[PDB]
Amino acid sequence: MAGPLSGLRVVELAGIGPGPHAAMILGDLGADVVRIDRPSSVDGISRDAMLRNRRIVTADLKSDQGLELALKLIAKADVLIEGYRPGVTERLGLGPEECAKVNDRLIYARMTGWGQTGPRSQQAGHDINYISLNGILHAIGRGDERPVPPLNLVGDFGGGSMFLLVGILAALWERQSSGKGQVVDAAMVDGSSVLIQMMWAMRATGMWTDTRGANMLDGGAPYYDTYECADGRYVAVGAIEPQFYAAMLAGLGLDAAELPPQNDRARWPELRALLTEAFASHDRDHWGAVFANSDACVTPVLAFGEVHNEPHIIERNTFYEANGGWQPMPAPRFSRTASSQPRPPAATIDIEAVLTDWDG
Amino acid sequence: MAGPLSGLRVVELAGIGPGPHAAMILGDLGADVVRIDRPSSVDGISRDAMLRNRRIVTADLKSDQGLELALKLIAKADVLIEGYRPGVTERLGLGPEECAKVNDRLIYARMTGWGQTGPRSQQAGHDINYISLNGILHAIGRGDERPVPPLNLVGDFGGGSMFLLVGILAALWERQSSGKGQVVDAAMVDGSSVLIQMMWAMRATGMWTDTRGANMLDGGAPYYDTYECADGRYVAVGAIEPQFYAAMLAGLGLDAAELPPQNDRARWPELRALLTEAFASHDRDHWGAVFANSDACVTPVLAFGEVHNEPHIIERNTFYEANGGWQPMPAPRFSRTASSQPRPPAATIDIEAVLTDWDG
Numbered sequence A, B: 001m002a003g004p005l006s007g008l009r010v011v012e013l014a015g016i017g018p019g020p021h022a023a024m025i026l027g028d029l030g031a032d033v034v035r036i037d038r039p040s041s042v043d044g045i046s047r048d049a050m051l052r053n054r055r056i057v058t059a060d061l062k063s064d065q066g067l068e069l070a071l072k073l074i075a076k077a078d079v080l081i082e083g084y085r086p087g088v089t090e091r092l093g094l095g096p097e098e099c100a101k102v103n104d105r106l107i108y109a110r111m112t113g114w115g116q117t118g119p120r121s122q123q124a125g126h127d128i129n130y131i132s133l134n135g136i137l138h139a140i141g142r143g144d145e146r147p148v149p150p151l152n153l154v155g156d157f158g159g160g161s162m163f164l165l166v167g168i169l170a171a172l173w174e175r176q177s178s179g180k181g182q183v184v185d186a187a188m189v190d191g192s193s194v195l196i197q198m199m200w201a202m203r204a205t206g207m208w209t210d211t212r213g214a215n216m217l218d219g220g221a222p223y224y225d226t227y228e229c230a231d232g233r234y235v236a237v238g239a240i241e242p243q244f245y246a247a248m249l250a251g252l253g254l255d256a257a258e259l260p261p262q263n264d265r266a267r268w269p270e271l272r273a274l275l276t277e278a279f280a281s282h283d284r285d286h287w288g289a290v291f292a293n294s295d296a297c298v299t300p301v302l303a304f305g306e307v308h309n310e311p312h313i314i315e316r317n318t319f320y321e322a323n324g325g326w327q328p329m330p331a332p333r334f335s336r337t338a339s340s341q342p343r344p345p346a347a348t349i350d351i352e353a354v355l356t357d358w359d360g
């Protein structure tokens, strides 16, 4: 199996959102990932490409046989991933204490939203709920409108799965010293708060307000925002540093002498009006050509459907084709032990067959 | 130093955005992190709390001595982080090969936006630019308006720092088996694409469209969006599963038989108007109480300045007081080798002191 995590053995108690995304990435990087779903499920081969780089098995964990077969897998594995409410694995007999008794090298990885304790620990939730409580959702969107969810990118994945991964991998480094596994408690409400640590830092030094749409990085700055072009499509501008901003102005055809200062916030309305009129005078693909190879920090805002035609995306092989649809290649990249293309979702496998393969 | 990464040694060449965030998380989890800045930028004790859990040393890397001293650090370290454009470390004589001569065990970690090669590889950029090229930015915001940046959470942090971290820690694992370091190439355009793999999967199965504001998780669904309340503050609704959705309607006082089906998308505008009126008739705190302990997936949308008063936040100690204000505690959490509270940014120390501390 190709990639730096070759040899790593992972058991995933099937769930939704972050836990499968973490499991996918370990698979992506060469880990041997075995996914236990319930049998009331899997109608053949999955169409869900997030379940790539997996072996799927089924098992009623409520039954005695199911539980015993699960515990045999966990006994021979490096990592367990579960993302059910706190208490579910305990009551099923697969809690950390029970797993510790059959394999004290195990990394026991618990993926939740609210965490393992506290008043909300049993409420159902999704990404939008977890980022609503820690101040993040309130900060996203235009000032004159209600907050808008940044898909499920910030809570599920960026503040969820990715912190789960860092915990798993940090714990595996620690196990090199101690010879011992441990519990990783990854909560989306905590992870996402660390993801936005910058804003908490800037807020302490008066460089970030709670007012939505009135900061440097939320769309409030005329030089960090999107602009509509002549054709109704968009470019993005990210010209924070004065030398990049000057390059953008020159490319737009505006003399610095006619505009207000870049960071005179009281004249941002005027500046936005000027940039708006200038970007609106040609189409997105015009601006893309003008600004290619420049430090102006102006790029076209591509729709998913157009991404496959962008030279820089093509050349670095950011995507691969699979089942009438492009998919992202593994990230990040490794000089010596490169990842390979992902394997598609396979037909279910028998759980004894895995135990035998794992040397049993 | 508490945490699973006790005894990991990390040299950070000072940059902006993702590299410092990764370095911070390594520190947070107990790595020994030494940050090399240039003498011209360091003034008093640094007031950017993203520079917590570091030792700061200055060193003109363009000088012969600065270079020599830095190669002596790298010699004694496990990981090097650099976030400059490609070519930059090479010309300093700190490139991956100069480093492999003094330490073939080093994990050489390169944090860029566009990658190591390809047509955009020397282009300046920020978060908003990296996410504009791969479909992500186009998908964020309301449909009748231009895309809005989700702060810098998706490119720098979620698809940036976090993948550098997964790469550093996966390579340390590969290394335990091979004796050898390697180069980790973390490109924000790649990481952020993997971060949004769920949407690529969903597009292939016809379950996601390129139309902004017309999807389950982008704000188009009336049951996954924010609503304004009687006091002008907001709640978030994330009631995807029908049972949770049903529980939400009952608490709004709405008879499910009077409403269009949850997932009849042609009638979503109509459903939204009914839910809008319901949520508008009481204030945020009313709804927060009404739905406490519920599975209705309705949560108050708090501003940063209110987060310190939320019981679930207080009781799990997601934050600690510092400096000007609250900052997020390390994530994720570990049962045996637990992180400790972050050490503030300390004063600059001399690079010889450090080399004493690390031996040769």
Ligand SMILES: CCCC(=O)SCCNC(=O)CCNC(=O)[C@H](O)C(C)(C)COP(=O)(O)OP(=O)(O)OC[C@H]1O[C@@H](n2cnc3c(N)ncnc32)[C@H](O)[C@@H]1OP(=O)(O)O
Residues within 6 Å of the ligand: A015, A016, A017, A018, A036, A037, A038, A039, A059, A060, A061, A062, A083, A084, A085, A088, A092, A111, A112, A113, A114, A123, A124, A125, A126, A127, A128, A152, A156, B240
């Ligand atoms: C769709 C995008 C996702 C997002 O945006 S992230 C949102 C999801 N949130 C999380 O994942 C955080 C933690 N998880 C949760 O809060 C809950 O799992 C979630 C998602 C609310 C779903 O709630 P429920 O459906 O109530 O599930 P739960 O966690 O309370 O318990 C799971 C039930 O499944 C059972 N189970 C799981 N694997 C099984 C197996 N192989 N065989 C037999 N039974 C199995 C388990 O026994 C439990 O059922 P029960 O309570 O015992 O009736």
Ligand SMILES: CCCC(=O)SCCNC(=O)CCNC(=O)[C@H](O)C(C)(C)COP(=O)(O)OP(=O)(O)OC[C@H]1O[C@@H](n2cnc3c(N)ncnc32)[C@H](O)[C@@H]1OP(=O)(O)O
Residues within 6 Å of the ligand: A240, B014, B015, B016, B017, B018, B036, B037, B038, B039, B059, B060, B061, B062, B083, B084, B085, B088, B091, B092, B111, B112, B113, B114, B123, B124, B125, B126, B127, B128, B152, B156
């Ligand atoms: C504010 C929010 C941030 C976001 O939203 S993320 C966006 C940032 N993008 C990235 O970090 C991607 C990779 N980095 C870059 O593209 C560039 O570094 C970036 C951010 C465009 C800035 O470009 P430049 O300022 O041109 O910097 P550069 O990386 O090209 O090279 C800088 C020069 O600094 C020099 N330098 C660094 N540390 C030094 C030291 N200790 N002593 C002496 N010289 C030192 C280094 O030699 C380099 O080269 P040179 O002077 O052109 O040869």
